[PDB]
Design a protein around this ligand. Structure first.
Ligand code: SA8
Ligand code: SA8
Ligand code: SA8
Lengths: 244, 243, 244
């Protein structure tokens, strides 16, 4: 099983065999909530459309795609022992928030994902990255994963847009896999979670298959009430397949 | 231990022995929060006054009481294996939310109770029953529990009304048992919780016993401060107001 | 290992010996958040400034300090068996709340601390003490602890004031230890950060400060300028040292 190069919520990698079991076949996979990319990295579609609201994520993904060697080399420079302390961390963090250069931002952003508190990505109310120092003994530099993702990206487009716009991009030869922010047990709202179910109903009507993952709850069985449902044990996870 | 025909919060236990331990005796038992009826169903009062704000519940209970055979036969028809899929569950939910016939609604409510998600009874902001499909393997049809409920109901009146109104029907021959929506750890408010203790203080003074159960917390010991308290094992509390 | 005479939040002290391991040396210890006094009672500074916002607390401590004997004597009389029931608990609670005598208030207040639900100290919106009856088998009367506190109090001043005013009383010869109300898993986030800023200003002036809290994304954010130490205990506890 190939690993994502970012520490990122979801694609904590079980449920892969289960997603790949119910994931239908096609020329193209659309992921409106790509995140770490672990579905992308462990399937073999001939092409990919991959999207996410987080503009730092997509921008880094676009750099890894088009400037592979230059990127890896600059970013390796920051995984040295001299950088594993707070004095350097808060220094690199301040540079990230002050910079207008996407390439330097994207080198920094991988440093912050691996040297920061629980690998979180968060922002205060002014748009600044505000995750504090993570106090790790030995952060891994993910060389192999970086190369694997770049190779695999040669068959992908990355967009920074909302789930509605990227699902509109799908067509007759597409399959859609949605991994929205989890239902409860400004962020992603209930209106939006139900909205995501609607678009799917629209897509299957046109013979585009859609698969959605999420917790198993009263609200999730309500919203996906017209998919074929599949509970997977582990609290429980729910897979909803809209199969023409 | 006679089982209730409905699933209903709790469930499903009511620590009945501990309740019956402290529950005084009289001619008539008043429950302002009847719910599933565990206590009604497992005691021997000469008679009962039974009440709840949920009007779907009370209407059902009057129908089981007055039209037993008619009801059991119409409800049994929804328990056939042909109705055990999503397509049918959502249709029946819609039929129930659109019906204005009490009998038909009472018949569909049993189905929704037994085929819906975790046995919940919930409504959206438009008043529609909104529990989704439970996907159960093989729902039990509570035929014996139905008939026991009906037989026992012969000595019982049912009222859809709030706890202050049902509690005013008690007299010197009654006992009152209170199972309100739980204290914390249009829902039932803190002001209503305290209000219930105070209606209880005024009852016990008119020589009418009241027993209340709840979680054991800072707010419940404060509200029940003038009753004898017994802690049972989160912890349960039973506040007894004895003359 | 000397105990506090009050049951009180964080008076449960599974640290030390971690606080003392990390607490610097000096003539005077300032506590802005003394509470029940554990650090005070288990250290050997030549003098102390001890402060808290709760005025029932500070008034009590002034009384135990300055009227040790009449106090111990009057309090002892409430710790009998006829007082360990609700009819009496609520009677004394109403007395405390109605009273304007500080001496009798201080006497009722220890009764309420030991006979009351979970040793809580809480007021309602009218400012009346509102903890209910705690139903304990037999509450212990903290005689020896009272004298130990009184005797140690001879080297102490007590002020009823906010962390900002107490921390201003520290000088060259002082050390400051802050035990604030816990960060979340009423004291505000804005105050939580203000505290760390005053500490920063103290260390600039060569006055050490040690702070204690839960280990969280926020506490690491606020205390980002201290040397930090993590104590396993069950969520982790953080200690933050601002050393010259
Ligand atoms: C992480 N993905 C979910 C994983 C997992 N189910 C969880 O909740 O932990 C969500 C991805 O959705 C992205 N996202 C959030 N809102 C939107 C949106 N409105 N449109 C597209 N992507 C979004 C987040 O950045 C995130 O990368
Ligand atoms: C189920 N009973 C409580 C069981 C349990 N202690 C729990 O909290 O889950 C509560 C019952 O009280 C009813 N109820 C809620 N509010 C009122 C009210 N204001 N007056 C009368 N009954 C009420 C509910 O329909 C419910 O049937
Ligand atoms: C109990 N103390 C220690 C905290 C402990 N870590 C806990 O959260 O359980 C906090 C003390 O600080 C006091 N306190 C609350 N606010 C302030 C303030 N603004 N200034 C000084 N003391 C305060 C409380 O009365 C309390 O006694």
């Amino acid at each position: 099983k190939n690993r994502a190069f970012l520490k990122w919520a979801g694609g904590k990698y079980p449920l892969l065999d289960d997603i790949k079991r119910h994931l239908p076949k096609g020329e193209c996979l659309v992921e409106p909530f790509v995140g770490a990319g672990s579905v992308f990295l462990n399937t073999d579609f001939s092409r990919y459309i991959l999207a996410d609201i987080n503009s730092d994520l997509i921008s880094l993904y676009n750099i890894v795609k088009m400037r592979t060697d230059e990127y890896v080399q600059a970013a390796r420079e920051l995984f040295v022992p001299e950088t594993n302390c707070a004095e350097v961390y808060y220094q690199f963090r301040e540079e990230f928030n002050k910079s207008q250069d996407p390439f330097r931002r994207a080198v920094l952003f991988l440093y912050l994902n691996r040297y920061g508190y629980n690998g979180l990505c968060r922002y205060n109310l002014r748009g600044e990255f505000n995750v504090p120092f993570g106090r790790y003994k030995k952060p891994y530099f993910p060389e192999a994963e970086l190369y694997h993702f770049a190779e695999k990206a040669q068959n992908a487009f990355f967009y920074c847009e909302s789930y509605a716009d990227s699902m509109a991009r799908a067509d007759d030869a597409s399959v859609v896999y949605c991994d929205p922010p989890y239902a409860p047990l400004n962020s992603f709202t209930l209106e939006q979670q139900a909205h995501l179910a609607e678009i799917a109903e629209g897509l299957v009507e046109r013979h585009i298959p859609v698969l959605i993952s999420n917790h198993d709850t009263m609200l999730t069985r309500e919203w996906y009430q017209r998919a074929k449902l599949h509970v997977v044990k582990v609290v429980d996870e729910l897979l909803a397949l809209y199969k023409p």
